[PDB]
Symmetry: C3
């Protein structure tokens, strides 16, 4: 169908790690789904010792919000760059076809907005990110990425075509940060975004992140902000990394069904311990919780996770299952 | 079945690169398979110029021994931390469900042991590793990891469901090491394990290993210690990397059937030149040797292999096959 | 069949990014396909500021030319090392079985040549590279790699066995370079290849490339040298990385069908945004262009692409399609 003749619907986005309400399988026909995002440049505290990032965001968050449509829908995004920002921006949707993912049609200087439509003709989780000519990596590594999820119109399916359904979706964006240090060995704090550029590029070129964070800060997804679930609930964990590879893992769990390349027309793999999100992509994993407790969800380069920040928590309520796991003998003195 | 009512069997582990005797397809019903491992902290020489690592091991080796069960069995591990060690330890089985892989139920201080049971309900090769709170990466990168192999009860299968059988299994654990240097440019040698910690963490955070070794040392799997096979033999090569990605390759061979994500309910890929083991996982490859000679088995970042240590040898006996490969003209002067 | 009794054919190679003419599906029976390559050591300018590499090539190019045969053919390569070169060389075909991929049978000192035959019994794209004992990574990272493509005799197939056909093939070799700097912060320029060795090895061991280039130089596949296509054309993009992982992506496009591990007997994945080429392998992607314009084809570590060089262009002619993508509102002032 010609999108000019299709029904339009507007979606209200929600901040990560939540995902806006949506159907999985749907009876709806194709629609033009309208979204708006407003770019916000801001200084963010990214760790527990006060380090700041001169950040750049879609909608005020790292990652930007997840946009969910169904295959055959059209995404119609209004991208707003307020006059309070300093830099030009745009958006490149990996789910889109043509014009550098839309970037060529969405160059917005501060004070401008633009509206792009594209057909979401391929199912999967797809990165979107800013990509202004001449400063693409800087915008991405400063925070400007998120996920478009294009669900099959009949929902997710296993390799045999059986329906998969999730009760809750969470979106995790993992950001490799390149925060400069000065000659005194301390991270630099910059008064403006532009002042951070040259020093950051030099760090970028070392390919060694200073920090690797989920959702904008060390510990973002811990404490009051841990993800939650219950025994018996099936969760979809969407993981995006717009610049650098990562290897997600749920400690004490699995990926029951995983699309690590993120494209739902391909059969998922089952029983994964750790999966692999290629830099420049989003993937997705389903897991049904079977044990209560506080899980970690992390990048299983354990240095990247525990030293650099790429780890969060999932607090799960419910009944312990001794068939799956039992402490036979608690820690005690070695028998003589 | 309730594991409390199942038969128990004890397995005697063997040191890598061998794997303890086991059946592939079995007629046995599910069992509780009992294993014991004893942690050993020790200083190890890891290269040919005398560099030492303040190492930490399961059962005295890097990797720890491979534990083999069948899907539906229960693993019942007694983990022993002798009083001669300095650090607390535990174990996280990626094959297990709950309690941070068992780590929360197996915290053993020196002088203690604990016994954990879990259902091996998912087939595959799975990493196990130590994970003590607050010092997880250090224990892993110091040597505390190995593989649990959970075989399908009817053995390995190809994508069409045809039986695959191996004649011999080898286990290769690849360890990215982070050995500090001092101001004189020499690797440091520490009197105690604890003394190595701060300096090591700083190296870890650079994400650049000093060494990347198979099975505990540069050249571990070479010379008298090369792996062996014969023409006609099918070998299973289990490869674990608990912290960092690797890309195994058999020079002059292939991965005939490879589960690079390591999970046997998924179809394997065939004819691989190089496969990919995500940090935090174990995978497995089958190969049937068709040519004699000394093969290399290595990480195909060739710098990681040849400069940093991630390479071993397989010495294969048998008859050369000129249909597969023939030297038509030996090296000789360029024709005029 | 015994290759000694098969028909022989000679192929004339072409320089990257083109691929020599070949059939996809063929009615031909198996043949011994004869190729010749001549090693050329030479100094190359690799970036826009005059940096040089003491390079080593097959046939004068980075990558070496792509060799195309069909499964069941035999490859019979004459490798020539002219007396004007300084180093010994050989060739390791990942598509071959035995003798370290042929390297043990092809050690040629300057002034020598050798001829190797092997059965191309496995379909896929496979790396070939030089591998002289004691200096393997140096030869590879200095430029000595390319691709052997072994097509199924009936052409490429989708997961259901439907025929895939491409109109044009391009070959992209991605090279992580390790160019030393001196104490003045400038890249070194060496008078001879041998003089570059020690300093290069030290850089290699940092695992941080100075440059990551397609096809021999920053910008090699841009400007007059951009890849080309038309709307409606299906292109096969062969991507080789003999030493280090990469993650190809077509900006504004997709991988319609991708064999990221490069082995055509396995089903491809569809709709990929970004795929993954393990260091030490070649993979292949098909894409049918649906929009005109200048695409980028790049490694989606965007720092590696835009800062270090791993990006090229595809200039595509044809008609813009507003169903796939439309600018609804051009950039304009934010509504009041
Ligand atoms: Cu931006
Ligand atoms: Cu992108
Ligand atoms: Cu430990
Ligand atoms: Cu783990
Ligand atoms: Cu060479
Ligand atoms: Cu190789």
């Amino acid at each position: 169908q010609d999108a000019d003749k299709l029904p339009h619907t507007k979606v209200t986005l929600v901040a990560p790690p939540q995902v806006h309400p949506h159907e999985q399988a749907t009876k709806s026909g194709p629609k033009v789904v309208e979204f708006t995002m407003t770019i916000e440049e801001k200084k963010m505290v990214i760790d527990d010792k006060g380090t700041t990032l001169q950040a750049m965001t879609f909608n005020g968050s790292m990652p930007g919000p997840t946009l969910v449509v169904h295959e055959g829908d059209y995404v119609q995004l209004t991208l707003v760059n307020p006059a309070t920002n300093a830099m030009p921006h745009n958006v490149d949707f990996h789910g889109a076809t043509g014009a550098l993912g839309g970037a060529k049609l969405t160059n917005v200087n501060p004070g401008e907005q633009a509206t792009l439509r594209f057909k979401a003709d391929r199912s999967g989780t797809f990165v979107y990110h800013c990509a202004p000519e001449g400063m693409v990596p800087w915008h991405v590594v400063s925070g400007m990425s998120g996920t478009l999820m294009v669900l099959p119109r009949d929902g997710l399916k296993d390799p045999q075509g059986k329906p998969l359904h999730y009760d809750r979706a969470y979106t995790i964006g993992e950001f490799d940060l390149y925060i400069p240090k000065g000659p005194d060995g301390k991270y630099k704090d910059y008064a403006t975004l532009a002042e951070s550029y040259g020093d950051t590029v030099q760090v970028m070129r070392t390919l060694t992140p200073s920090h690797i964070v989920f959702n904008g800060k060390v510990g973002a997804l811990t404490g009051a902000n841990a993800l939650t679930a219950k025994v018996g609930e099936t969760v979809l964990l969407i993981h995006s990394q717009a610049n650098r590879d990562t290897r997600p893992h749920l400690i004490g769990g699995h990926g029951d069904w995983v699309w690590e390349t993120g494209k739902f027309a391909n059969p998922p793999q089952r029983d994964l311990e750790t999966w692999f999100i290629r830099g420049g992509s989003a993937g997705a994993a389903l897991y049904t919780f079977k044990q209560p407790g506080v899980y970690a969800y992390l990048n299983h380069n354990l240095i990247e996770a525990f030293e650099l920040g790429a780890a969060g928590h999932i607090k799960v309520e419910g009944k312990w299952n001794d068939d799956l796991m039992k402490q036979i003998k608690a820690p005690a003195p070695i028998p003589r």
